[model samples]
Target chain A: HMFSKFLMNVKGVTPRGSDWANRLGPVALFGYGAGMPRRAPLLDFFLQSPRDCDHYAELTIHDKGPIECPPETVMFMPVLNCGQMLDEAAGTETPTSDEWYLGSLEASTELLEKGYVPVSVGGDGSATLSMVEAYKRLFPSDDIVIVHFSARPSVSDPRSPLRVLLDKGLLKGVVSVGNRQVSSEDRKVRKLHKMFYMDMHAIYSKGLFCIRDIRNDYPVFISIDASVLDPAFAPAVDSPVAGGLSTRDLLHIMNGIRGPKVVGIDVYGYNPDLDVYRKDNVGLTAIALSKIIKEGILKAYSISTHT
Target chain B: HMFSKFLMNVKGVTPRGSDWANRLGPVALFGYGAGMPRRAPLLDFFLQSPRDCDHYAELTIHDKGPIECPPETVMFMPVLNCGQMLDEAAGTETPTSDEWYLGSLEASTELLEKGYVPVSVGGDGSATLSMVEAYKRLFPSDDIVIVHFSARPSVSDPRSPLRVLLDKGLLKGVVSVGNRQVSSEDRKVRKLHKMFYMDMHAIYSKGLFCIRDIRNDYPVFISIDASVLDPAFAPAVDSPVAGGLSTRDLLHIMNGIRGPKVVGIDVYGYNPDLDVYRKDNVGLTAIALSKIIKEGILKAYSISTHTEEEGMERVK
Candidate 1:
């Protein structure tokens, strides 16, 4: 297995299982938003250079140096895109077959078994289900709670991923935030299942307290659909909802997300097409992704070691 | 004037004011959703046949027959398509210049002065603003209220029509129903303005009561963006929100909307391209339009005849 040359140079350690300390260190990160032969470059922006990864770490927890153990661990996994499904219609991509999904399960299963916290970038609503299923298979008895963030609620369809997980009894509970678009059916189902939902208003009022309370109650897996960020902040999304949470507010929440445990995080739904229209800082979405990983996942690990 | 040959064959009367009764009868309807030379065919489908017009009137206020006077009045105006604006880029249409809008103001102003209740079909968010502006110009000092129904609230932007109207004090109040998409800005503005908003859950519970209460309070102008209907019922809209009102429920509300007065109605937001994917009936959206016109506008005119035709405001 070839290691990222940058990671090799920085830590001067063998990648993966060659060294016992290296094997236990680092969260596994990868990209698989699109089909075979084409990758989503949006994910690559987060860990493109040593400086990008180091920058986020500095902003969150200073003095957390390059380490030999799991506290400051970060691993870059090769992106998996193993299917013939293509999006040639100029519309949203829909996988025609189960090939790519099957590949995801295999890759994530191996990483979970190796004790690496699996963090995926670039994929939308359905892919999060596959990621969660991987965790469910490895830790069958553990109750997994999901914290979902998106512009639109994706659970209105009966065939939606959250509904499927709940029906199978694989999910313990779900907490939805920053959703502006919700159906009557979505509301009814949330009530029936006793799921927690907070629209923009509720989020503005008490989002941090709500997240802290949920983390106290259960073990959490976080799913982020980047459209939850206001178009003013992140313009390169497939669907842009005008008045969403600012990137600043998102960073505050992601940083403050201390809990019983933070299992894994998937940040998805950034489209490279709209990159040309970005008004503010170039590669801002990537910076946002790096900060989320740093504060939301790596910092959680660092805090748990102390506790 | 060249009238619809279909209307001439059925009614055996002149199109406009040749006879005083003919002048006083028929509501004026037109299509102006898009721009230049190309008119939206979605509006044409509603009055394609005398049968289409008669069917909707039959279902509501049945005793109302095709007459020479105000009760059964419905006049289909020539669709207004003016100026150089075009939608060639395969995305949503944005008018390049104000030429087409200027034409709309001229056409609507004439109709309003001539004592006709205007009903427009085939347009979206921005066009409704122009329609309301025309009303404001003609009927200054009238406290205007708007009943807006759409899949998404278009009022989040500070420059939105509702916000603009409220800011200018041209609007008295607003009632929004069947919207699934709203932003924090939209909610905040709606709160500050004290606008009545009903999401799908609230609509399913108390929509009829809410509409009735609003009607009793104020004279209303109805704006229907067809995306308010579920995609199952009206799929050919520019933006489709998944869960919305059923056509049957919408028809019930339009029928039951007997009020202080219904000043005008604009039913827009129908796209002809997606019409190919209609799951159920072929022309369901047009049929929905016809029913709304019959039960909402015409019935209001008919009921007012007993009260000495409050809807009758002739130019003299």
Candidate 2:
């Protein structure tokens, strides 16, 4: 309990690992009689009481004088709790309240600036679609290049963020480089631009070859769904998809950009609990990303010209 | 306390969340009584003793086929630990041993190859010296361009790695975006090549403007001592210096490098404990660096040619 108080940066709502800081103590006394979901207060207590130190011991949380983000870029809200976009088959909308998803787009529309190209980086096809849609809301006039790397060619929804944004003429171009089954919507998105269908083997060789042909007109905003990668590399995605790009391939892709005009970057869908159940997947993820952020991303921007 | 046992990255050791993981439990157990540094097998016992799951629940100690670093590039050693580099007035070499510093250069020299530029990222002018010195050892015949952002015009020791390396005629050139106060050594080094003495307020407008002039001759290796920052934004540095580059100016410098060929990077001297103590310094440093790594460094490379030629940027 208080012992685990020392542990911070767990991010997950639960205490995990083999450290005193990971021990969730007396707070459990406030839980439901048994297996109940009355742990909201428990979750709230910890988020507000994050332990000292940062990502290293840990990265900072704005105590020293963190550079204030331009107010326009600020938006705070809880993530979508639970919901589905559409019925799996029979093509009907699933009924549920998930204001969290819309806020994602709304947040981007208000927070971002003109010509800031959103680089789609995370959660899954659905999340990537949300970003494309959000960027559209922000910039309706300019044509956008919705780039994504995911396992499945098309998401389940016909009106997924991609189709809607594309139909609206927001997609300036499309670039996808996932090695998996391709669906018809993917082909439809492909028709949107010939440079659309991304072949992993070719990318492994061309090294952002598509980018080589495109005009560097907009600032690149990157968002990565963990599912963009092989489930082996990122097991905690919203839903695991096999045969995705490997960890090595992903870094190379990032490295291949060698640096572009980037505005913002996001990589999401790390389920802490799922990671724990999957054998240090979280720790492994933490380790893998440490290098990517520390080494890979730096090279992407700082040394892009030469890379 | 046994509670903080899993703290393993703390810079001071003991894996203090303050230091992060550098904090370790067994090492603390043999302390100086009631908190004393003791010498006994107890240290060994704990070395062989780890409690159950958790840091009270953690485990990526590798059963899951963790990403193995390129076997060719791995060297682990504790950091150099010592004191002031020189006595202020006399500028005489100070006492204390911190061999850990050289590991950086050793790693660079041994791990890298010819024509491979090492982009010096973090770390102070001191660590920069280690990298420069080690690099000279690795590629004696080649010219090197040192791009460092730090606090002092120069490191304290007259015998510091930078001067020695410069005197030896190894450093092809140097560009420092650190705050003002040029030292005699700075002048001497500047004499090594005309590209010395980086005036930030001036460089601020130019933005790695000089890295553009110097022939893309050497592979660039960047080193940034957090101390180079105004202590306000980065309080975790080895030494705090005020009137330094503000956080705004610092990002400008990072974003300024329109583009340049960078081989490797090192950003050191982020004393996590110092950060922890400084309230939000750690967070501040984290934020300061996120964009730098995510976007700035990449542009430093890919866009180097045109960004250099154009000397123009998209928008603030």
Candidate 3:
């Protein structure tokens, strides 16, 4: 099963006597299941548990059938269990139930104790709050930075943990980019916080040229929602506004973040059913996340002064 | 009141700046009364009238507000009044009323009479039937060919006009190409008609080079919906299915149509609210129509058969 998951599967052949086959060769294999569902945990486990990588050699999950991984592959079992718990939590009305939130915190603590980074793949923008809270608990004395890309000025849901944290004096400093117009109520709510708001038109005018110009401290928590992408590029999202960043533009912003103190990253708001043309949005997500993991986080941390 | 609609407009800008602005740099300039409640008739009227093209310049509908345009832009407006009539008839459970289908017929008839090819921009694929019936009425002896790049075997709604036409023997020879899996019911329907169903995967498996290689007689009708485009490319659609043509692929197929008789063209299923980025599905429709009108119909028909060899050599 792990072999099937690890190995690529090629489907459908090019025309027998086409110019495409001759120029590019008939074996033009593109990404198959490269960004399929349930892959994030596996990828996370691989990055966290490098020593047990070989143990994951045979795990495979079929779209319609049972999911099985090779026994030899090191079972990054905790991450998988965490994913299930999060999924269960999200399916319910109150995702912030003490059992769910506390359980997630306990899981992260356990992984951290084992000398493995516990990255959270959240259900919504609020997931960052839980992750940040966990991080704060782990490193209490460290000064923190929070950067969020939001379309709305403030989240309307009163139960949002991020808003709760910001209200309760837990969140240190916030730098928000790409907040377009909002409702009067939302505006009043946002006026209460010391938050930086960059309008959509400004972003359009400047592109990523101004992103690097922002003066902020290191060791930041970056929360990116799929809605931040222009609806043209990522339409299957929940809160797609008319104006947002392109895929290329988002990548540039992520690439610009240069900080060894950057402790973690979170990406959310992926609804698979909204994804038409099967695998395109997911595939692009995989590509984007892969770059962030390879070039942004892993590389940046390698040369860091902090242990 | 118009100024109110004008103020609420959300404009689209080109990333490469305005100097490179062609049709590609389409901005979502607000109209006089856009997105306002109880303005459906005004919106409908705008959609139905050729003079509405003037609104592009007058209102700056493509770019800035107080949308303004030059007086001389040619407009092609589809008669959506027919759709309203159809809806009313369906609501009253008296769809057989002639008034429901007559507007569609009249719209098609008027376009043909005026030497302007009629293209139906639809709410759904079934809307193609109105134009088909009009063509049959206009040219009873003329052979009809329907080429569809369908993502599914059948329309989602069973009561759609396309299915009605199929049952009533209006559709002549149908050729569909795409990755749609046919349901058993749809399979039975196709069997009854003996229509040409080309599975997209089978075509890929075979060495058939292009859409041009697929044989279809002249006087062709091309109907394409945004759903045919890969969802990644066109996510603002109502139903985004997996495994469809890319925008470039659709363009190439449209480019490949060779015709001494290309009768009609239609692009439909555009929802502006869904398309938050204001990327140009409507603009692409305009460009594609212009290409067909210029390259396929006008250029081909403009050449005379008698002087064709002499004219060809002269041109060469």
Candidate 4:
């Protein structure tokens, strides 16, 4: 039951005799249920438990089934559980912050070694650190460019994923998109790191051009923070911002990217407790996540396999 | 108070001297609150009064502001009220079915005479019958093609506007888009009229081509029924269809039409009682209507003026 709660059991296979890839690619999709919980503690009193990332993960994947992938690629769910894997693997019954990172590194390393593309989700933006770290360890010579979508720069903190990546010289380039929040600290961090920042204005004016410029020779990793979307479309994000890109604009930008082999992708910062769900349908957050997976991540994989 | 409830009083103006049109065009946007309401009678018990199309119009334009137009064009609001105008003109407090059609005809005729392109809304599919009838009366010699967007054919009824137009030979051609409902009667009516039909299958495969073909050397009228949109985006429509075009696909199809001068447009079949409104925001129906006006109707006006001007320049 614990295993079922953490990861999916069924494995998918790519159809044989595809012209794109000589060998079939298996994509690993999992919820890394680890992150410092945000928002007021009492806010979750009327909602779900505030600190329980597992509950958040369950709500995200609740009614939504496996993402639809292209015929040339297979998909595997529940590759790793960031929060509880450490408690099960090590002697510790309670997972600490270090254990979360260690488990992610271990799980991600295994997936990379097996030639699988990892599509992780359900942690705070900090969960990206370990996965990117694992990728750097495996492919030291190969440089990676990341496409970060969020309302605020997640690299504002020194220990944040992108900041740490910059420190380690692992990141070749970073194209930060859909940022609406203003911060002197975040601003300095971006300028100091030479981040290719595309504000909301750029997104509206030259979104297709912005997306096309990111499709270079390097393998791209897409990191989506749910707050990148306006609160009108996706209100259940960790940090809800008023002025952000619409779901249509986000899909357009993702689909507009022409080339660049997509290595991996991650979706973070969705708070299911804040979502609005009708009796008949899932919340907009779940719908947004499903589209991102099918249209953005899966489409990117199809592009990589083909031309 | 009744006039305030029925139509908007704001009169907008275009800035002087644009390259496109030497004389500015004023677009009239109004809620033609007259149509046969279709739903369960008791459904209005927990909802708004079912027959009151006035209440539905209020809900549609409730919080949504005026439609955004280009710098070269002006937009007028509440130019006519179909349900109320009949009562005012004919001195009848209770409006019968014929009164609604008469009011629409009178209102539409005045707008066309004043060179105002009418952008009407908030009625069932039947309300369109009178508007087109009025347009044909004004331009007897000029032929007008229509682009109809609906989940079901409005022309199944013999008294329907398009059907009457066909009988009178007022319509040049008809391009019916987004018909998903299966009906033998509707099929025969379409075939007998020789309507150029584009179903949901064609919309997915070649929607652009379908739209482009409708743009010939004639004036076009766009008619929209809210059920053409999928229930996910717009659930508050009169007849909700499961598999229909998305709001994105609808906008794309509207924007794809290029050449023809758009005479007028009407949006119908939205039931505000069925809408889900949050505290901070209006319902999805209002948003869809706003986009249709701003992107579809207003954009068409801009295209018409620019092309007509460019033609003048070529002749000179």
Candidate 5:
């Protein structure tokens, strides 16, 4: 409900898809929208710039946005955004959204030739598979690492992209740390696949070292849902678990990851109504993102220069 | 009721007086009953071992004991043991049974003698007056200083020993520092006597230094009841006032006394039943006394020795 209000507030200023391109000068523009109100003007901003339709010449669209086609400049689309087509391609509903996301894998390979990093942000934790597919497409021979703190084994809906990734065998060297008590069936499935699933106790004992070891060898994709924290720590999330990471612990884990191949990071499941102290959560989220920018992205470039 | 139980428990020990004598040996004794049960035995011990009794004999005895004319060779004698005489002197109908204790004045007088310090282990805050009387008797010419952290000007009963001291001209140069939300009549009485009172707000603002200037000149006798502490900090007292001294503030006041005239110290109003967490009151009382022993008695001597080495410093 708050998300709809937030979108409306954002839309009130920008007016959904109303083009302000004619009024404003050419500044680098990033368009972000999802869940509600997919209007034509919003799509147009992505499709056409006042200067040229094919200015970037390559468009990598993350499916977290609505399922709309943009100017066809070597489009890398997550297959699930195409809905029924994605289901047909996978031959099951399990790979529903993930198939659409994985379809962008071919487009990512094409973007590598142009020396562009085609990153896809997803709506949920499941969208991490699309990122893995992109990495696999770019470096076919290299190993892939997915590090995450997931509270739930699978999204309840069969159409989850995480299920698709599991069915397709796309998640290689998946290290899921800080999974609280899970069902026997989920545990067995995770074990049989040779996936690393560390429960709460293990994470508490080893701390962030559990994730640091995984980042050492393979190209890593890190995804954190706010639900990974206890409801006391982060009450705003849609899915709250009893025991999850504290703010301090979460920061330490993020600090452990290294290398340029940590292509993107996504944070989801922030349902504002559930938050007890709403301002505190918002402030903490801002502080965390700032730390990630400083330590993860900017620090990496500085270290390279010093070497 | 608990006090009665405590009295019974004290009496229960076989060869009751000797058991108390043994119990008194290891522990640093305080209160009106400090030397009560063992007064005769202690006198005997002192007479046989003069050196041991000499220190106690030279000190003040607030309330006298049952055996008034013990052998003078017995060293110290109680100046006032009102408990044994309460029935005869104050009348049996009076509730002085609970209010009057054995050794307030006797303990005070013994400490007034040179090289000896009188310390009163009071049953209630009222024992402060007996100490004042002891100080007055010892240093007749010298100004007497009395300091207290009390919630009210006086305890409930007007005929209480504390009020009697106020009625009589025994107390002089008095300073009180604590919460003073008592009746206006009490405030007027305190003011008419020219008593310096630092209320909770004043103490907070000026800190313990408000009492420091007055304390520096006179031989100070300090009295603290657990009720002086904020109810939040020390809820387990016979009577707890809402706004009271914090532990740190109480220590600061004691430290400010630096080294007052060799007189008595009293800690009272400790009731264990009102306490949560069993015997916390006893532990708190023990700790407060330990601090006094460490800082007041022992530290003063140590500091005097240090000042001797540093010629510029003098033992105040």
Candidate 6:
């Protein structure tokens, strides 16, 4: 019972319940090009929580395939089946998952244009960073900020999208935590990033305020990495820290945050092989996303109508 | 931790540590079909404690069987040659591994005759129950109690009346796994066997009894089934249903029981494929068995031992 209560009993309290589900309005659905999409590491499992509890919203679940994006409240991106292209064929442009990522990147832009609220599951921190980069690059300018949660810092040579995206005038700022330290060597990059310097515990357990301070523009992108959580709780992350945020806080952090300004969400990097011990590592994550969407829209959009 | 502790540092402090282990007179080593022993649902994982710390008594580890039960303070029953016999070929005198079970049964009897305390890895629940049947048949009039964790494989099996015993706070080391009851159809069986059908919620939250109720009785037999744990926590079990013990709880329960009067152990039906998603299901079961064995022998047969309630003192 130490596991905090999720939005189990709070179904359909939002405006997008059966009322809007029947309209078949545009709802952005994102999936991993690899592995099971509806599971963690992808946005599927997180999105599935609301649907699992029967909150109204027609769904297009992706098993595997290629298809065009459509408006179906709930949608699934066809997974790329280009098997084992993690080799030399990766950079060679031999018609691998690059085609899929290209579509996925555009899908992010298209969803925003269509006025659909977005939610994402990052395989890790960088996957969401990539999505933000593409969105900023497409528009050239906007008040783009990322409310990110990560265990591993993304200032290394990701071309370092977390910093690079902000420095190039693509993103406005970022609110994130989970770095061991931010040394003086990267002080210049720190200027671009307003790092929170706190863990999910501050927001959930301590009932702290975060994610709302970076209100530079509307439609903020929220990216989540499992590494933002401690490894003891979510041992399956690609790079897990020995200690991190508790599972209880992860859900509450999402549930407590209001989200009218929230734009799009993308989740990637859910590696199944590493999670040998904890099977339901992805199970709890599914619940976390539903809370965010419910708290975001149920409080914001429900009270105020949007076209 | 709110949870209770079992033996950890009571080695030299116990009468059996250097006391009886130095004599190395007798100790029984048993295994299931192929995999681990002293673990749960199989063997040894539940039995192994920190003796990987230090103890002079012999050990029975997993090496896949038919070897001599050595006196090195550690022993392992070589697994029987069971060629995937969850098939229809079961129960017939078809000469598969039935002989192995017979020999295993005899090994239980032989070890009992030798007076070395017995600890069995039932592979599943039935393996140790089979050993129990053997031991009881050998000595029909003895103060024997099967402190069985549960029935083998599924709830369809003959479960005991531990539920009633649990409500009255009678049995020690109780785990009310899986919500499945003895079934109205098996009402007669329930009447015959008293089971404490407590749910996992009680142990985790309220903290129920530990393993010591049968200390007043003579040698006790402990058996475990994976069905006793929650499928959400350990989903890869053999016919695991929803609502069972948590893995954390399963470990704590194993750690909470100190052994001396404990006679044997059996672990069965730990299917590997079911555990693909939860790979550590059996791995932890293996780890659990070792804990019980480590706690049992060190405390039970020690020169200066404490009561089961006052069992192992954790290093912390």
Q: Candidate 3: which docking quality band?
A: incorrect
The CA lDDT of each predicted structure is 0.58, 0.41, 0.45, 0.59, 0.44, 0.43
The CAPRI-style docking tier of model 6 reads incorrect
DockQ of all predictions against the true structure, Cα-based:
0.01, 0.01, 0.01, 0.01, 0.00, 0.01
Q: In angstroms, how far off is B76's CA in candidate 5? A: 23
In the range A1-307, model 4's lDDT, one tens digit per residue, is: 2333332322222222233344323455555556633222211121232211211221122122233323322332222212233223333244556766766676667666655566775667656777787888888888888878888877777878788888888888887878877588977777687777767765566433444322266777788888898888888776588878888778767665543466677777777688767687457776666556545434444444223
> Would you list the clashing residue pairs of candidate 4?
none
Off-target runs (Cα >4 Å) in candidate 3 are A1-98, A113-116, A258-260, A278-296, A299-307, B1-316
TM-score of chain B of each: 0.71, 0.53, 0.57, 0.71, 0.58, 0.55
| 5 or 6, greater by TM-score | 6
Candidate 5 lDDT for residue A134: 64
Question: How does model 1 score by TM-score?
Answer: 0.40
How well is each residue in B72-191 modelled by candidate 3, as lDDT tens digits?
343322121122222322233332324334544555554454333444443444446666777778888777666676676664346655567667776667776674567777787777
Question: Residue A96 CA error for candidate 4 (Å)?
Answer: 99
Best by lDDT: 4
* lDDT (Cα, tens digit) per residue for candidate 4, span B1-316: 2233233222222222233253323455555556533321211121232212211222122122233323432332222212233223334354456766766676667666656566666666656777788888888887888888888877777787778778888788888888889589988988888888888876777534444322256677888888888887777777588888888788877765543467778777777677666697457766665555545444444444223321001100
Q: Is candidate 1 or candidate 5 better by TM-score?
A: 1
Worst 10 residues of 5 chain B by lDDT: B304-313
lDDT of model 3, residue A125: 51
lDDT of 1 by residue, B200-257 (tens): 7767775444443122445567888888888878877776788888877777655544
Candidate 4, residue A112: the lDDT equals 62
TM-score of candidate 4 restricted to chain B?
0.71
Give the lDDT ranking, best first: 4, 1, 3, 5, 6, 2
